[PDB]
Amino acid sequence: GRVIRNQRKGAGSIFTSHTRLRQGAAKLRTLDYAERHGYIRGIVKQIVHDSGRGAPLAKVVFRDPYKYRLREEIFIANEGVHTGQFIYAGKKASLNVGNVLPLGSVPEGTIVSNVEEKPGDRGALARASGNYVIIIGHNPDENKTRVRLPSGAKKVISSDARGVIGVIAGGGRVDKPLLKAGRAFHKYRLKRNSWPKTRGVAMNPVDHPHGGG
Amino acid sequence: MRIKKKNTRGNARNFITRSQAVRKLQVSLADFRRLCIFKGIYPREPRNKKKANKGSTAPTTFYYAKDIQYLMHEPVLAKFREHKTFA
Amino acid sequence: YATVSKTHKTVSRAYGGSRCANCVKERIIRAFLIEEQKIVKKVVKEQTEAAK
Amino acid sequence: KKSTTSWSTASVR
Amino acid sequence: NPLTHSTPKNFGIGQAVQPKRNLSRYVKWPEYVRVQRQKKILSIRLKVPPTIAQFQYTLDRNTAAETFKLFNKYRPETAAEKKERLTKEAAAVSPKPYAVKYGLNHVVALIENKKAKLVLIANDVDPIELVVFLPALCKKMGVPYAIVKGKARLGTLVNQKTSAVAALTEVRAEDEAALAKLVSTIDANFADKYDEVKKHWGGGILGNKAQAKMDKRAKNSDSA
RNA sequence: UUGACAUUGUGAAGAGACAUAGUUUCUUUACUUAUUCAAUGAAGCGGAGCUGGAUCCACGUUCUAGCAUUCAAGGUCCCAUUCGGGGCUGAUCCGGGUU
RNA sequence: GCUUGUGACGGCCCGUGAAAAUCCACAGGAAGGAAUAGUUUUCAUGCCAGGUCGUACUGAUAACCGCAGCAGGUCUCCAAG
RNA sequence: GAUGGGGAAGCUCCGUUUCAAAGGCCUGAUUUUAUGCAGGCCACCAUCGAAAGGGAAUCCGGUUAAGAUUCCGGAACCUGG
Ligand SMILES: [Mg+2]
Ligand SMILES: [Mg+2]
Ligand SMILES: [Mg+2]
Ligand SMILES: [Mg+2]
Ligand SMILES: [Mg+2]
Ligand SMILES: [Mg+2]
Ligand SMILES: [Mg+2]
Ligand SMILES: [Mg+2]
Ligand SMILES: [Mg+2]
Secondary structure, three states: OOOOHHHHHHHOHHHOOOOOOOOOOOOOOOOOHHHHHOEEEEEEEEEEOOOOOOOOEEEEEEEOOOOOOEEEEEEEOEOOOOOOOEEEEEOOOOOOOOOEEEHHHOOOOOEEEOEOOOOOOOOOEOOOOOOOEEEEEEEOOOOEEEEEOOOOOEEEEEOOOEEEEOOEOOOOHHHOOOOOHHHHHHHHHOOOOOOOOOOOOOOOOOOOOOOOO | OOOOOOOOOOHHHHEEEHHHHHHHHOOOHHHHHHHHHHHOOOOEOOOOHHHHOOOOOOOOOEEEHHHHHHHOOOHHHHHHHHHHHHO | OOOOOHHHHOOOOOOOOOOOHHHHHHHHHHHHHHHHHHHHHHHHHHHHHHHO | OOOOOOOOOOOOO | OOOOOOOOOOOOOOOOOOOOOOOHHHOOOOHHHHHHHHHHHHHHHOOEOHHHHHHHOOOOHHHHHHHHHHHHOOOOOOHHHHHHHHHHHHHHOOOOOOOOEEOHHHHHHHHHOOOOOEEEEEOOOOOHHHOOOHHHHHHHHOOOEEEEOOHHHHHHHOOOOOOOEEEEOOOOOOOHHHHHHHHHHHHHHHHOOOOOHHHOOEOOOOOHHHHHHHHHHHHHHHOO
């Protein structure tokens, strides 16, 4: 039969992401000697809107430990983080909002965000606005940490894996009705071509398995 | 004609430093000095050292680029290479 | 800006051009105060180590 | 005078 | 000197820029260098069958020096002095020559005919099958043999770049006693001394970090 | 989706057969060298220090939108002092594994 | 008053509304530079040079497409009482 | 959209900085071994893609059957040396 959109989307074509206005990929620093053993201080220079993303982003500038220059990182902004704030990243950083710490260096009940699934993959979990990860517990013998994810799942992660103290800013976004096909249009214009959606029932028997009747 | 780049013409092309001359000749420093003595190549003073050396005031030995290009064709250089192979 | 003299592109102060007067004043104040506080912190730490 | 090869000397000081 | 002051640099984390250090341990070497280093490491790490591991036992420094001292007196005729002999042969129309025998097929044939008084086998032959049968063949034929380090050394012996084998077949009367003493020395130093240890397998050697882990685990098992 | 064979290596323990010396199978538990995944600026890994202080740590960085780059100043030993030049250290050692 | 350019503002967004070439400035100070002599071509004046290709005209109820000198189709600027 | 590589019987396909020894620069009488280059520094990937995006610098008057911010006269400006 004729190919449906569900199968047509795999080839790419007109279904790729609309990435012209993106500020950049939001990642933590590469896990290096400084973050493994001590800490490093960076400064929040600005907090910016990222097109196609609900959560705002924070530009954090660090000093290169091996060469005289500055290094720019794009973090997802946790709520309460402000411009001019000093962010501390490393094993020895303090428990404050915005600081990046290993999951083994935080106590139980700690709320984190932008959490690594594996140490050094630069943030995988709790990145959408208003989301966070809870530190349920520790297994020091296996160097593991039990955490709870936004979907209610419980996961076991390496304690070397990092996370940002706090909750991703921009929460409560989905509580407001769009009210308008135009607002949905402008929403998906900055994301991808998945709108509007035609029901499979409304289609023909050749078009969709739900078609016909 | 498009805009031409700076530090390419005039003093910057007229003069070549000793390091650049040695690199272009692909010889050692001692062989370069002996070749310059044999051929009578002498160091020169540009009227604008900064224009000749990209704004640096550091003291450098300068030569004529055309003199070094003429030195490229001296058969004593090939004799030096032959001696190195024999050694 | 390549066609004009340096007077048109600068003011006669540190960071003349790149930074304005109030920002320059603020970073002067901050540098001085933080260096003094660093000296104070070093003296305090050495005294605490000696008395420990 | 004229070069027949790519690398020539032609001996003009 | 009141104009010079001491200004130490803090090279700690989050402090002054790190100085230049020796990063030789972290160099991303070219692929051929990485291949040769990892190949030698793999040869060390893997368990080696005895007929290959027997080539890791060679002559000692002194005995190898004496052997090459004897063989350099029988280094073969060069291309220049063969011309001199042929000029002398052309006019006369030469004594019997004494020379080190070389060439794999030639030396294997001499061993099979029981004519080689002493055989030297290079240890670093690749492919190794070219000489892997030679110690057993020499033992079966009763030919004295020694495994030596350096096919390049044997090549210098026979005026070549390399040489997988060398053989002394016939020697002068002013060196027969030296050859017999060298044969007895090789019998005492290489044949009898390494007779049993060449029957074992080699290369069961752990890496540095794996060995440290095993030692730490054994220590934690034995005491707490 | 399930099973078999090949890729496919190394040990230890509990069980077997030559009729109570080591020649090969079944489990159990480990290992790394094959293979596989990921990252990097292949930068700080592993182990040890009669290193230090109290098994743990570096006591080199946490009021502040500053600054941090020219073989590192200094200490010490030489030179033949001359516009400066070398070495040890500052900055522990070892490794046949970039992490 | 019309058109247009600009300024300081205000509203709107689960939309916050290009990149690079190129140019300048600062921080820093490897260095270079004067006493009967140096410095400064970001001040003025003076000298020399700037190649290749396009350039007519229509742009439409007759110069384009629709087998046509076809009531069709085809992007844009200026615009008086 | 090549190269390094990797697929494919193959015409060729993937991918666009990776998985590459991918290239420049500074100092030297290197304490002399006597005619052989020593000590260092910095590091990222071709090429194509806009006559409406970005962008060095020109105006007025006159002139032809048909040219015109291009020619003529006068007056400027930019880039490089
Ligand atoms: Mg229908
Ligand atoms: Mg015209
Ligand atoms: Mg037509
Ligand atoms: Mg037609
Ligand atoms: Mg392609
Ligand atoms: Mg182009
Ligand atoms: Mg344009
Ligand atoms: Mg006209
Ligand atoms: Mg004119």
